[PDB]
Paper text:
To investigate how a His residue is hydroxylated by [name], we crystallized [name] in complex with Fe(II), 2OG and the TNKS2 538–558 fragment under anaerobic conditions. The resultant overall [name] structure (2.28 Å resolution) was similar to reported [name] structures (rmsd values of 0.30–0.33 Å for Cα backbone atoms) and reveals that the backbone of TNKS2 538–558 is bound to [name] in a manner that is similar overall to analogous ARD fragments that undergo Asn hydroxylation and a fragment of the HIF-1α CAD substrate (rmsd for Cα backbone atoms of TNKS2 versus mNotch-1 and CAD ∼ 0.2 Å). At the N-terminus of the bound TNKS2 538–558 fragment, residues 541–546 form a short α-helix, possibly reflecting that in the ankyrin repeat (AR) of the parent tankyrase ARD protein. At the active site, the Fe(II) and 2OG are bound as first reported for the structure of [name] in complex with Fe(II) and a fragment of the HIF-1αCAD. In the [name]·TNKS2 538–558 structure, the β-methylene of His 553 is positioned such that the pro-S hydrogen of its methylene group projects towards the Fe(II) centre, suggesting that it is hydroxylated to give the 3S-hydroxy product, as observed for Asn hydroxylation by [name]. Histidine binding at the [name] active site apparently induces a stacking interaction between the substrate imidazole and the phenolic rings of Tyr 102FIH and His 199FIH, which is one of the iron-complexing residues. The imidazole side chain of His 553 in the TNKS2 538–558 fragment points towards the γ-methylene of the side chain of Gln 239FIH. Previous structures have shown that Gln 239FIH binds via hydrogen-bonding interactions to the side chain of Asn residues that undergo hydroxylation, for example, Asn 803 of HIF-1α. However, in the TNKS2 538–558 structure, the side-chain amide of Gln 239FIH is moved away from the side chain of the hydroxylated residue (i.e. with His 553 compared with a hydroxylated Asn residue) such that it is positioned to make a hydrogen bond with the backbone amide of Tyr 102FIH.
Factor-inhibiting hypoxia-inducible factor ([name]) is an asparaginyl hydroxylase acting on hypoxia-inducible factor (HIF), a transcription factor that mediates the hypoxic response in humans. The [name]-catalysed hydroxylation of a conserved asparaginyl (Asn) residue within the C-terminal transcriptional activation domain (CAD) of HIF-α reduces the interaction of HIF with the transcriptional coactivator p300/cAMP-response-element-binding protein (p300/CBP), thereby inhibiting HIF-mediated transcription. In addition to HIF-α, [name] also catalyses the hydroxylation of conserved Asn residues within the ubiquitous ankyrin repeat domain (ARD)-containing protein family. Here, we report the unexpected findings that two histidinyl residues in the [name] ARD, located at analogous positions to the asparaginyl hydroxylation sites, are also substrates for [name]-catalysed β-hydroxylation.
Numbering used by the authors:
A (entry chain A), C (entry chain A): 11 to 349
B (entry chain S), D (entry chain S): 540 to 553
């Protein structure tokens, strides 16, 4: 039953958050375990690629002091990717893929700007009362201020690097800094990288689905701009088009300052910043997965079959010389033959 | 090799 | 409208055959052209892989004298594959594939025997009045009699070899000798080899469908024993399972002694020995197709897409480690995503 | 090569 009894902030500052801050959905969820990084059960979950919330890693300890004012004064003046939207849902769009699907138009636009420019617009909406929404999603790089670099260096690289090694994972590919408005939502989708989700400011409700629930979440075609994202509108599920969504079961939890959520590769995750909970700041750690094992075991695992399906779609798209021919060939292949 | 071919995967994220 | 006005046998011996000898089907058919091997229109059809009936090739001229008695006395005593069945339909079965589909049982059994043994059984049924059916399908080889070898050598290798060269086809892989009882039928299927179908004794109605009618003929899954054959019962079409069969359109013709039918690779063909027309004898010439062109043109041709679909099914079957998992993965891939 | 891979075909007959 959900993310459990809201945790109590030390010092008798009351419940960190309350139920009325969570959105309502049609599916059931069990809690993701909250453990100590020293707890062998936590090492057990990660090794077996199952989610777990680590409470005491100190992964981004130096960032826990971060906020708009501090970051504005220390992040530098490089460009920051900022997505805008007229809805609480920030569906991701692959622009390199927007060529294929021509009659296509995003529900959220990307825009570059300096951090102070972002804070301005954030402020502009606030003091007037607008309905526009903004979500800053920018990779951390060479152009950040001196202090930010100091904080970054303070991250618990000893612990995470050891995690990287123990899992045989590839290299750290990036750290995405995410600053969003309360109520914002990143629709269900899966990533092809292992993720250590480090919460810094505010709270986020994280709903995860195992890879084996692929048939209940209906991802868009691989060549579509929204590849890897679910086509189901969690707020108004179309059970005629997506029958098996009625069978979807999730794992959820609410992360706050100091928590690190392990989002295993290929696991679906729906992420929302609690309603009326203020802005949120997160920093993730994306690592390329381990290489394919020298010996395959049968039957294959769910994430592997997902890998196979993705490949089939890619091969057909390239072979047919046109992505729009993938669907028809696929249907011709199964109709009256495999269904 | 075919399985190995079909098991390979990209590294797409958001 | 069908195989046209029955041809008249030279010498005023009347119509070679009549309509009441043809079985009735639910679909329409246009006539395959009957031309002279010298007719450039015939060379045009073959080059473009479209069927054509050649009337004067003399391909198997020496065999036109063949019949059971002559062959029994001259074919030798090697073993001859003979399929038996309780129905006029002789569905082909790949035995190497019968391992996969376990709860499977053939509608026709194979049996080895000497030619004289075959003639005996053919005779046994005749003089009593039985309902059993036999179809001899045996590859021509090293153990045939001296006279048979003389006939074989008399084949018009000059003409066909030149055909092999002009099309860039691969090697001649075999010559299947087919002796069947009147009324026998080889259900619709396609072959992965170019074929020169040489009629020798009796008449055969040949119904062909272009590769682009794949979606109307519903072939069994590639790993099934009846791979490449249509699942539709031409005598009692199941329009609930095979809706698009209602859209199938064929090309037909009736071949007799001396005719050579070019069955282009991947073209579906339904072949029946006319009812009450006596036994039939045919000898085909199977050639590996030309190699894949150095430059692909888009969009692909129907037979190429058929090649792609077959491969996808093979890859998935081997990748999933079990052929029975192909269907479920395929359905999971398209349901709510591509259909 | 992928197209060439998917275009290859066997030589199955009856
Ligand atoms: O925090 C969010 O809104 C999205 C995070 C995410 O999708 C990821 O880290 O993979
Ligand atoms: O003649 C028959 O019954 C079958 C011939 C055939 O299927 C072929 O030559 O490919
Ligand atoms: Fe993600
Ligand atoms: Fe055939």
């Amino acid at each position: 039953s959900g993310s459990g009894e809201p945790r109590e902030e030390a010092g008798a500052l009351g419940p960190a958050w309350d139920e009325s801050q969570l959105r309502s959905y049609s599916f059931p969820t069990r809690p993701i375990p909250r453990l100590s990084q020293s707890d062998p059960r936590a090492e057990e979950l990660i090794e077996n690629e199952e989610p777990v919330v680590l409470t005491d890693t100190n992964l981004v300890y130096p960032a826990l002091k971060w906020d708009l004012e501090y970051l504005q004064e220390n992040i530098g003046n490089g460009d920051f990717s900022v997505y805008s939207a007229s809805t609480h849902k920030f569906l991701y769009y692959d622009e390199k893929k927007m060529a294929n699907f021509q009659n296509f138009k995003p529900r959220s636009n990307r825009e570059e700007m300096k951090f102070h420019e972002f804070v301005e617009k954030l402020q502009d909406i606030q003091q007037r009362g607008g309905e526009e929404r903004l979500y800053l999603q920018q990779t951390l790089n060479d152009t950040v201020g001196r202090k930010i670099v100091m904080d970054f260096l303070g991250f618990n690289w000893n612990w995470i690097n050891k995690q990287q090694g123990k899992r045989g994972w590839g290299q750290l590919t990036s750290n995405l800094l995410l600053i969003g408005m309360e109520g914002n939502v990143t629709p269900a989708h899966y990533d092809e990288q292992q993720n250590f989700f480090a919460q810094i400011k505010g709270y986020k409700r994280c709903i995860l689905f195992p890879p084996d629930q692929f048939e209940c979440l209906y991802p868009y075609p691989v060549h579509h701009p929204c590849d890897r994202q679910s086509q189901v509108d969690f707020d108004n599920p179309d059970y005629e088009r997506f029958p098996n969504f009625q069978n979807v079961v999730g794992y959820e939890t609410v992360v706050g300052p100091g928590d690190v959520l392990y989002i295993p590769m290929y696991w679906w995750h729906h992420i929302e910043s609690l309603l009326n909970g203020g802005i949120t700041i997160t920093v993730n750690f994306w690592y390329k997965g381990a290489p394919t094992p020298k010996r395959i075991e049968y039957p294959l695992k769910a994430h592997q079959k997902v890998a196979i399906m993705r490949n089939i779609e890619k091969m057909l798209g390239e072979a047919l010389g046109n992505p729009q021919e993938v669907g028809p060939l696929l249907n011709t292949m199964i109709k009256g033959r495999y269904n | 090799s075919v399985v190995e071919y079909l098991l390979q995967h990209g590294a797409d994220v958001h």
